[PDB]
Design a protein around this ligand. Structure first.
Ligand SMILES: NC(=O)C1=CN([C@@H]2O[C@H](COP(=O)(O)OP(=O)(O)OC[C@H]3O[C@@H](n4cnc5c(N)ncnc54)[C@H](OP(=O)(O)O)[C@@H]3O)[C@@H](O)[C@H]2O)C=CC1
Ligand SMILES: CC[C@H]1OC(C)=C(O)C1=O
Length: 321
């Protein structure tokens, strides 16, 4: 990985951009000529191959986090997979030509980049990236970082460990599909229970749930079974706290959190992906893609509209970019 010829990297590129807050159907526009970000010394420039959408992208675009956002206009997209084309002078872990993936924003709600992953090129901090597993496609890799890292961090915050039981509220989404798989296959849970609607129960079982609960037909909090860990990925902490054993832990990623549940927001770290690499290489933990994925780069507004419906099964990914 010697440097690319500097004139081989463009200074403008195609991207999706919004200039004011609002609904993606209203504000998200394609721009054929936006600046390619200049890298800082601890960043790399990536030729984007694929990107995933996350709810944070649309919530951010609605202005929910305006007080700590970066300045508009914004090119959205946190999740990226692609190929390194330039490395900053303090970078040690990556070279030109490395295939990488990660969630661009170390702190999702505080100064996320102006120059996201829904663009042909993006700048990424070395610290948020990992080497792409050779057995995963770029679509598959792009689908992973924000969700899998949120799953991982919530389970560590809940102190999940071998032999314990866990209940996942929202098992079929981008995050929940990884909560299940990590809980069973990485954290050694004895029993994994998860909620979803009627047609999604078989998927939950396939991913590692021992008990799949149809929330449209029964109320988990009214079951006699109580769990060592409850991980809420929906926003139902009032009920979650009724399903935990005394001394157990309840975490949520959708606030506000009713004590004793806690709310956290993930920290994006390439080291987490690196820790998970063997499970990803062996197939013990798999990417989960929505059947409508991938969406071409022309169809980003439609991809957002689908994610905004709250019905995605696993991940919504944009490819080719
Ligand atoms: N705090 C943080 O760090 C983070 C927070 N988040 C937040 O967490 C939430 C989940 O994100 P993500 O997984 O990407 O979202 P998705 O849009 O991928 O979740 C969609 C899934 O939610 C399921 N679902 C919806 N309502 C319910 C319910 N009441 N019970 C069970 N399942 C339900 C749907 O299954 P069905 O069709 O069966 O209802 C669908 O499969 C979002 O609000 C997001 O903003 C996400 C990541 C990090
Ligand atoms: C309430 C958490 C906020 O942060 C992330 C990453 C989301 O998806 C949110 O809504």
């Amino acid at each position: 990985g010697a440097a690319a010829p500097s004139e081989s990297i463009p200074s403008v590129n195609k991207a999706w951009v919004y200039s004011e807050y609002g609904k993606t159907s209203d504000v998200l526009k394609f721009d054929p000529s936006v600046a390619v970000p200049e890298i800082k010394e601890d960043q790399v420039l990536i030729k984007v191959v694929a990107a995933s959408l996350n709810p944070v992208d649309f919530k951010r675009a609605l202005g929910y986090f305006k007080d700590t956002d970066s300045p508009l206009p914004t090119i959205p997209g946190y999740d990226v997979a692609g190929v390194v084309v330039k490395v900053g002078s303090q970078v040690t872990k990556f070279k030109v030509g490395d295939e990488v993936y990660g969630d661009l924003n170390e702190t999702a709600l505080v100064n996320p980049t102006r120059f996201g992953s829904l663009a042909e090129y993006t700048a990424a901090d070395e610290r948020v990236l990992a080497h792409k597993p050779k057995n995963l496609s770029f679509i598959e890799a792009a689908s992973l970082p924000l969700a899998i890292e949120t799953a991982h961090e919530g389970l560590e915050r809940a102190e999940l460990s071998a032999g314990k039981s866990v209940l996942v509220l929202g098992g079929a989404g981008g995050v929940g599909t990884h909560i299940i798989q990590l809980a069973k296959h990485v954290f050694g849970a004895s029993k994994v229970a998860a909620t979803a609607s009627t047609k999604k129960l078989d998927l939950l079982r396939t991913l590692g749930a021992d008990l799949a609960i149809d929330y449209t037909k029964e109320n988990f909090e009214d079951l006699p079974e109580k769990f060592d860990v409850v991980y809420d990925a929906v926003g139902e902490t009032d009920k979650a706290v009724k399903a935990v054993k005394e001394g157990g832990k309840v975490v949520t990623i959708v606030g506000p959190a009713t004590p004793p549940a806690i709310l956290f927001v993930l920290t994006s770290k390439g080291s987490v992906l690196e820790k998970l690499k063997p499970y990803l290489e062996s197939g013990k933990v798999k990417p989960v893609l929505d059947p409508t994925s991938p969406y071409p780069f022309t169809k980003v507004v439609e991809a957002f509209g689908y994610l905004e419906s709250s019905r995605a099964t696993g991940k919504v990914v944009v490819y080719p970019i």
